[PDB]
Amino acid sequence: HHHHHHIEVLLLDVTPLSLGIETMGGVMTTLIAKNTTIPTKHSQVFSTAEDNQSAVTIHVLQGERKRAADNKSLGQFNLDGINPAPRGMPQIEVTFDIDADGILHVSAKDKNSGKEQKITIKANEDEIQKMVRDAEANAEADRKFEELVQTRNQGDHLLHSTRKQVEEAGDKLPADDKTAIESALTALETALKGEDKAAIEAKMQELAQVSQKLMEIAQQQ
Amino acid sequence: HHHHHHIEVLLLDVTPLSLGIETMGGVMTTLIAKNTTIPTKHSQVFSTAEDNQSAVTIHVLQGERKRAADNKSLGQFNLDGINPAPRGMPQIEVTFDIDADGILHVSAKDKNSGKEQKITIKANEDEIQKMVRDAEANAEADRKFEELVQTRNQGDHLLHSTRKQVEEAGDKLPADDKTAIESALTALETALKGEDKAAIEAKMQELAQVSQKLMEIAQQQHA
Ligand SMILES: [Ca+2]
């Protein structure tokens, strides 16, 4: 009683360690997780970290730790030529492609300009298990580090965008709100220098709660 | 910042449940695992399950269970027009793309012909945690099921290639070896209907024990 539309998985190999890139704050962002079946192709879209940034550096990493510096370095390259735009607007697609020969191809492409750059990384046993074990021993500190960096980066963006809004609003912003917002901005700046995720979240919320008039002001444009 | 070549994640959003397709034996094969940051595009190449198969069905699934039937079905489509070839030779690339708006694009492309079909899927917190808890409660049964399917598919491939080798050997195969191989093939066929991975593995080894001359004939023919 057979049917004839079935699809079969081709199982040739799996990756021994995670593969990814370094991102803002010294974090390893994974593109291909440990144990992914190969051949495979994974991409994710990234952006710039400051206004009018013209280039990014892709640092290719191998390992299970969240701090980039605690992983193995496989290679690096730049993608130049990113057209001037606000932080976070350019769309840079980073693709990790592993072929049947086990060769890793990494590329970064600007989705807007089409500019592309790429590298090829050519295809341990006790070192692998050592690295897996080093990660388990630091799993808690690594999670806390990753969450802190994410929170800091979100807080830095909010700091910068809010200051920009204050400047554009000018005399349209009531003095009481401006005082409240400036105080909240300074408090968030101080929190961002620390290592306490909860304090940064609280200062971000305290800032949003006093900044509601900025959005309304922008709309009268 | 003191330096100016930094790269940042575009969004923080992640997928709530794993996304994949149904594969031979009723298994969900994941293309994008749960908690993957978006936008993301993941592709993998699959193939046909029988010789000269001309079409495949892509059944898109969402969830954490290994049996396809235990996950949510999000849609299906066929890719037809596949040129005749041995099982496992056609290269069908399946791509899952989730854009910044959270919209899922699934496509299947025949790498030979460039023929392509696709669907767009537009995508529930208590149901999510429900589905997660049930996958953990059933982790062992699910793994046993997946491992059984993998062993069955291997045994079926072996049944088929051995029968092919026997037909190619013809009169070169001694009658006694042919009998023993036929008997071992029947035993394996019977084991494949069961639910015991070890019995199937044992029948595969027993087949290797009686196929030595068949393999020697096979090698000399390859020569
Ligand atoms: Ca960086």
XYZ file of C-alpha atoms and ligand atoms in Angstrom:
445
model
C 0.000 0.000 0.000
C 2.760 2.391 -1.001
C 2.719 6.107 -1.806
C 5.449 7.711 -3.810
C 5.928 11.340 -2.713
C 8.201 10.692 0.296
C 11.298 12.802 0.960
C 14.392 11.331 2.580
C 17.031 13.009 4.698
C 20.629 12.708 3.468
C 22.786 12.094 6.548
C 26.495 12.578 5.844
C 27.966 14.251 9.002
C 27.214 16.669 11.882
C 29.158 19.671 13.137
C 31.306 19.002 16.226
C 31.198 22.563 17.588
C 29.104 25.674 17.071
C 30.163 28.104 14.313
C 29.404 31.829 14.324
C 30.719 35.373 14.426
C 31.683 37.976 16.969
C 29.037 40.669 17.626
C 28.888 43.960 19.550
C 30.052 43.552 23.105
C 32.383 40.631 22.426
C 29.666 37.960 22.092
C 29.817 34.840 19.887
C 26.591 34.806 17.867
C 25.991 31.319 16.497
C 25.119 30.744 12.818
C 25.416 26.975 12.839
C 24.791 25.222 16.135
C 26.750 22.226 17.322
C 25.248 18.970 15.952
C 23.681 20.481 12.859
C 23.613 17.969 10.031
C 25.858 18.837 7.120
C 25.809 19.849 4.257
C 23.793 22.875 5.366
C 23.454 26.610 4.732
C 22.399 29.048 7.483
C 22.204 32.829 7.293
C 21.155 35.595 9.634
C 20.793 39.351 9.028
C 22.895 41.838 11.015
C 23.439 45.589 10.977
C 25.901 48.353 11.842
C 26.475 49.577 15.412
C 26.850 53.312 14.738
C 25.506 56.025 12.438
C 27.144 56.216 9.001
C 29.343 53.169 9.576
C 30.937 52.182 6.253
C 32.437 48.768 7.051
C 32.029 45.759 9.335
C 34.568 43.127 10.381
C 33.443 39.534 10.368
C 35.430 37.430 12.866
C 34.662 33.735 12.340
C 34.563 31.669 15.522
C 34.270 28.026 16.534
C 33.231 26.827 20.009
C 30.501 26.768 22.678
C 31.338 29.722 24.849
C 29.386 32.994 24.832
C 32.429 35.294 25.112
C 33.976 35.517 21.669
C 37.503 35.610 23.092
C 36.957 32.172 24.688
C 36.390 30.495 21.345
C 38.643 29.367 18.514
C 39.418 31.798 15.708
C 38.880 30.472 12.181
C 39.319 33.608 10.110
C 38.281 37.178 9.493
C 37.379 39.616 6.737
C 35.885 43.059 6.138
C 32.864 44.107 4.151
C 33.387 47.691 3.077
C 31.189 50.040 1.078
C 28.097 50.232 3.310
C 26.153 53.335 2.247
C 25.677 56.005 4.952
C 22.574 55.322 6.990
C 21.460 55.421 10.632
C 22.777 52.732 12.982
C 20.792 49.547 12.581
C 19.314 50.334 9.165
C 21.762 48.547 6.803
C 20.935 44.862 6.256
C 24.004 42.663 6.151
C 23.276 39.000 5.475
C 25.944 36.684 6.863
C 25.852 33.142 5.439
C 27.672 30.023 6.633
C 27.577 27.268 4.053
C 29.120 23.841 4.719
C 29.497 21.548 1.714
C 29.708 17.768 1.347
C 33.507 18.050 1.447
C 33.117 19.694 4.841
C 34.530 23.032 3.614
C 33.043 26.102 5.329
C 32.220 29.099 3.172
C 31.431 32.325 5.009
C 30.048 35.408 3.258
C 28.648 38.797 4.156
C 26.478 40.702 1.694
C 24.894 44.156 1.952
C 21.299 43.506 0.962
C 20.871 47.093 -0.192
C 24.065 47.610 -2.222
C 24.710 43.962 -3.109
C 28.378 44.365 -2.149
C 29.746 40.992 -0.950
C 32.946 39.588 0.575
C 33.705 35.950 1.431
C 36.266 33.494 2.768
C 36.750 29.737 2.544
C 37.755 27.790 5.626
C 39.143 24.344 5.052
C 38.028 21.215 6.891
C 40.805 17.708 17.584
C 38.879 14.917 19.318
C 40.260 15.554 22.809
C 40.343 19.293 22.166
C 36.658 19.217 21.139
C 35.538 17.417 24.295
C 37.749 19.783 26.300
C 36.026 22.782 24.722
C 32.572 21.270 25.289
C 33.556 20.700 28.917
C 34.974 24.229 29.357
C 31.606 25.561 28.250
C 29.579 23.482 30.758
C 31.864 24.677 33.567
C 31.046 28.290 32.633
C 27.484 27.909 31.344
C 25.925 30.093 34.059
C 28.436 32.933 33.848
C 28.214 32.729 30.019
C 24.397 33.054 30.023
C 24.584 35.978 32.402
C 27.253 37.616 30.238
C 25.170 37.142 27.080
C 22.004 38.568 28.676
C 23.926 41.544 30.055
C 25.449 42.409 26.703
C 22.037 42.207 24.997
C 20.582 44.422 27.671
C 23.473 46.931 27.458
C 23.209 47.141 23.689
C 19.446 47.724 23.861
C 20.027 50.335 26.593
C 22.765 52.078 24.566
C 20.440 52.324 21.532
C 17.676 53.763 23.710
C 20.077 56.268 25.281
C 21.211 57.480 21.849
C 17.842 57.597 20.135
C 16.201 59.402 23.057
C 18.940 62.060 23.095
C 18.456 62.533 19.366
C 14.671 62.955 19.882
C 15.231 65.495 22.649
C 17.449 67.507 20.326
C 14.967 67.405 17.419
C 12.010 68.319 19.634
C 13.770 71.504 20.739
C 11.502 74.120 22.305
C 8.443 71.933 21.647
C 9.391 69.756 24.663
C 7.934 71.142 27.944
C 10.655 72.035 30.465
C 9.333 69.614 33.122
C 9.556 66.668 30.713
C 12.988 67.723 29.543
C 14.251 67.801 33.147
C 12.727 64.377 33.844
C 14.091 62.886 30.636
C 17.602 64.330 31.161
C 17.694 62.873 34.704
C 16.525 59.465 33.448
C 19.072 59.557 30.616
C 21.951 60.170 33.042
C 20.743 57.356 35.336
C 20.577 54.934 32.390
C 24.078 55.982 31.284
C 25.390 55.152 34.749
C 23.650 51.787 34.846
C 25.113 50.791 31.462
C 28.646 50.948 32.898
C 27.733 48.340 35.529
C 27.222 44.571 35.374
C 23.648 44.464 36.701
C 21.118 43.589 34.004
C 18.129 44.309 36.256
C 19.327 47.838 37.057
C 19.737 48.609 33.365
C 16.241 47.260 32.626
C 14.804 49.425 35.399
C 16.516 52.574 34.120
C 15.318 51.840 30.588
C 11.754 51.577 31.859
C 12.124 54.684 34.015
C 13.287 56.515 30.870
C 10.449 55.246 28.666
C 7.886 56.222 31.317
C 8.961 59.889 31.217
C 9.584 60.067 27.469
C 6.058 59.592 26.129
C 5.773 63.207 24.839
C 8.699 62.728 22.426
C 6.722 60.294 20.223
C 3.729 62.627 20.134
C 5.979 65.578 19.235
C 7.585 63.667 16.368
C 4.133 62.995 14.873
C 3.456 66.701 14.464
C 5.821 66.564 11.464
C 32.644 53.674 20.728
C 36.417 53.565 20.371
C 36.164 51.347 17.279
C 33.969 51.401 14.219
C 33.765 47.981 12.535
C 31.248 46.405 14.978
C 28.365 44.234 13.875
C 25.058 43.962 15.751
C 22.097 41.577 15.612
C 19.228 43.146 13.655
C 16.495 41.940 15.970
C 16.261 40.114 19.270
C 13.137 38.169 18.212
C 13.384 34.377 18.110
C 11.197 31.597 16.760
C 8.873 30.114 19.439
C 8.814 26.506 18.125
C 10.928 24.378 15.797
C 9.957 24.416 12.085
C 10.612 21.631 9.632
C 9.212 19.070 7.187
C 7.963 15.503 7.201
C 10.469 12.883 6.045
C 10.302 9.165 5.281
C 8.705 7.201 8.108
C 6.587 10.048 9.501
C 9.435 11.958 11.179
C 9.695 15.714 11.636
C 13.107 16.881 10.356
C 13.884 20.329 11.731
C 15.132 23.101 9.428
C 14.939 25.983 11.958
C 15.216 24.992 15.603
C 13.204 26.690 18.358
C 14.699 29.922 19.672
C 16.537 30.786 16.463
C 17.081 34.531 16.046
C 15.291 36.072 13.070
C 15.595 37.110 10.223
C 17.191 33.837 9.278
C 17.292 31.471 6.292
C 18.185 27.807 6.700
C 18.395 25.321 3.821
C 19.235 21.682 3.472
C 19.218 19.213 0.539
C 16.918 16.168 0.684
C 16.273 13.460 -1.897
C 13.732 10.959 -3.133
C 12.851 7.761 -1.255
C 12.437 5.330 -4.227
C 14.062 4.801 -7.629
C 12.721 6.988 -10.468
C 10.450 9.018 -8.154
C 9.068 12.041 -10.046
C 7.500 14.169 -7.306
C 7.836 14.953 -3.598
C 5.468 16.412 -1.056
C 6.743 19.117 1.302
C 4.649 19.023 4.484
C 5.587 21.945 6.759
C 5.457 21.235 10.471
C 5.779 23.311 13.646
C 6.572 21.841 17.069
C 9.030 19.881 19.176
C 7.882 16.309 18.735
C 9.692 13.745 16.569
C 6.551 12.158 15.062
C 5.263 14.365 12.281
C 1.654 13.631 13.272
C 2.253 15.108 16.764
C 3.158 18.563 15.449
C 1.148 21.371 13.904
C 0.719 21.234 10.136
C 1.247 24.634 8.606
C 0.846 23.724 4.924
C 1.907 21.427 2.108
C 2.902 21.602 -1.555
C 4.336 19.318 -4.203
C 7.406 19.659 -6.331
C 6.960 17.590 -9.496
C 8.912 17.023 -12.706
C 11.857 15.264 -11.125
C 13.911 13.440 -13.743
C 14.179 9.646 -13.175
C 17.235 8.636 -11.109
C 18.233 6.092 -8.422
C 16.804 6.692 -4.927
C 18.804 9.345 -3.127
C 20.339 10.945 -6.202
C 18.049 13.919 -6.947
C 19.055 16.987 -4.987
C 16.005 18.762 -3.664
C 16.986 21.907 -1.767
C 14.445 22.918 0.865
C 14.715 26.460 2.226
C 12.960 28.038 5.235
C 13.271 31.864 5.258
C 11.793 34.006 8.063
C 11.905 37.724 7.372
C 12.006 40.620 9.837
C 8.205 40.682 9.785
C 8.119 37.107 11.074
C 6.696 35.763 7.818
C 7.839 32.268 6.805
C 8.747 31.421 3.227
C 9.217 27.779 2.350
C 10.606 26.664 -1.029
C 11.788 23.445 -2.621
C 13.984 23.551 -5.695
C 15.263 20.816 -7.979
C 18.922 21.685 -8.316
C 19.071 19.967 -11.709
C 16.198 21.669 -13.441
C 15.913 24.837 -11.409
C 12.242 23.911 -11.027
C 10.849 25.457 -7.817
C 7.671 25.577 -5.742
C 6.989 27.708 -2.666
C 4.449 28.767 -0.075
C 4.167 31.699 2.299
C 3.074 31.041 5.842
C 1.829 33.922 8.016
C 2.097 32.267 11.484
C 0.097 31.641 21.181
C 1.917 31.542 24.511
C 0.055 28.916 26.553
C -0.066 26.550 23.565
C 3.707 27.033 23.158
C 4.581 26.050 26.738
C 2.033 23.238 26.403
C 3.807 21.871 23.338
C 7.194 22.235 25.044
C 6.147 20.321 28.161
C 4.672 17.456 26.161
C 7.861 17.089 24.129
C 9.936 16.689 27.312
C 7.411 14.227 28.808
C 7.757 12.148 25.669
C 11.455 12.683 24.893
C 12.337 8.999 25.317
C 9.463 7.529 23.319
C 10.142 10.120 20.596
C 13.841 9.244 20.405
C 13.027 5.534 20.297
C 10.620 6.228 17.415
C 13.141 8.260 15.472
C 15.859 5.633 15.960
C 13.457 2.898 14.861
C 12.642 4.827 11.678
C 16.326 5.385 10.864
C 17.070 1.657 11.344
C 14.072 0.677 9.196
C 15.118 3.006 6.379
C 18.691 1.570 6.511
C 17.317 -1.992 6.459
C 15.025 -1.215 3.559
C 17.927 0.256 1.541
C 19.941 -2.866 2.298
C 17.114 -5.217 1.303
C 16.877 -3.400 -2.030
C 20.602 -3.194 -2.856
C 21.173 -6.836 -1.946
C 18.343 -7.962 -4.236
C 19.935 -5.854 -6.963
C 23.361 -7.484 -6.348
C 21.779 -10.932 -6.462
C 20.122 -10.216 -9.827
C 23.433 -8.909 -11.190
C 25.404 -11.932 -9.967
C 23.090 -14.312 -11.798
C 24.470 -17.849 -12.257
C 27.838 -16.803 -10.798
C 26.278 -17.060 -7.347
C 26.432 -20.606 -5.958
C 22.923 -22.024 -5.392
C 23.568 -22.607 -1.703
C 24.649 -18.990 -1.137
C 21.655 -17.792 -3.137
C 19.339 -19.788 -0.916
C 20.923 -18.531 2.304
C 20.862 -14.916 1.085
C 17.203 -15.257 0.064
C 16.363 -16.690 3.497
C 18.269 -13.907 5.285
C 16.469 -11.321 3.119
C 13.079 -12.769 4.151
C 14.089 -12.666 7.808
C 15.119 -9.010 7.488
C 11.920 -8.164 5.656
C 9.993 -9.685 8.591
C 12.073 -7.830 11.184
C 11.449 -4.518 9.382
C 7.727 -4.852 10.110
C 8.423 -5.088 13.821
C 9.142 -2.360 16.312
C 12.444 -3.651 17.604
C 15.582 -1.874 16.393
C 17.895 -4.561 17.828
C 16.154 -7.405 15.960
C 16.477 -5.446 12.729
C 20.165 -4.779 13.399
C 20.673 -8.454 14.137
C 19.007 -9.455 10.845
C 21.249 -6.978 9.018
C 24.323 -8.614 10.522
C 23.060 -12.083 9.726
C 22.670 -10.969 6.112
C 26.292 -9.788 6.089
C 27.331 -13.291 7.305
C 25.779 -15.017 4.277
C 26.626 -12.436 1.606
C 30.415 -12.860 1.551
C 30.544 -14.649 -1.824
C 27.907 -12.323 -3.231
C 30.143 -9.403 -2.221
C 33.239 -11.091 -3.734
C 31.323 -11.629 -7.003
C 30.105 -8.052 -6.731
C 33.650 -6.658 -6.334
C 35.018 -8.652 -9.258
C 32.124 -7.345 -11.397
C 32.866 -3.778 -10.239
C 36.370 -4.641 -11.410
Ca 31.597 43.331 16.794
